[PDB]
Design a protein around this ligand. Structure first.
Ligand SMILES: *[C@@H]1O[C@H](CO)[C@@H](O)[C@H](O)[C@H]1NC(C)=O
Lengths: 49, 107
């Protein structure tokens, strides 16, 4: 679980753009207020190889 | 004596700091929590080290590179920008990969 990838973003990256940010992704009508929930996600998955 | 560049300028996203030390120029990119009103007087993805005057600078961000051009010239008169022409020459081409939407100057 040491390896991760971003599953969601506000918009696609520009060429060689690097984005660390772990602020909560809002996927819909739920106002997330800085925490996970229904349609609110921590934007990084792990591969679990 | 320098500049801040970024999107949030709060630590929620990375930002670029450029500072002149008179001994050196110091450049650093980090998740900085910058001051509410920064000042000078007597993690981190990248780091680098190296009226009478007019100093001119051009800044642009392209394909993750941050490009700087500059020129220094004397001036004869002090009211505002002197009418005329001279071209700025490339200073540095930093491979930083950060997004920029806002900036501020360090007085
Ligand atoms: C760069 O940051 C701005 C900050 O407002 C944001 O709107 C934009 O989506 C970002 N650019 C890319 C290519 O994601």
């Amino acid at each position: 679980y040491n390896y991760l990838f971003r599953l969601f973003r506000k918009s696609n990256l520009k060429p060689f753009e690097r984005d660390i940010s772990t602020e909560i992704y809002q996927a819909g009508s739920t106002p997330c207020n800085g925490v996970e929930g229904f349609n609110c996600y921590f934007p990084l998955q792990s591969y679990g190889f | 004596r320098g500049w801040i560049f970024g999107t949030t300028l709060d630590s929620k996203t990375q930002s670029l700091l450029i500072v002149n030390n008179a001994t050196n120029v110091v450049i650093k990119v980090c998740e900085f929590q910058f001051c509410n009103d920064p000042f000078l007087g007597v993690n981190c993805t990248f780091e680098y080290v190296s009226f009478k005057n007019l100093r001119e600078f051009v800044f642009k961000n392209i394909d993750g590179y941050f490009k700087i051009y500059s020129k220094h010239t004397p001036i004869n008169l002090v009211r505002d920008l002197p009418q005329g022409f001279s071209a700025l020459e490339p200073l540095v081409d930093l491979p930083i990969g950060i997004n920029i939407t806002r900036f501020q100057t360090l007085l």
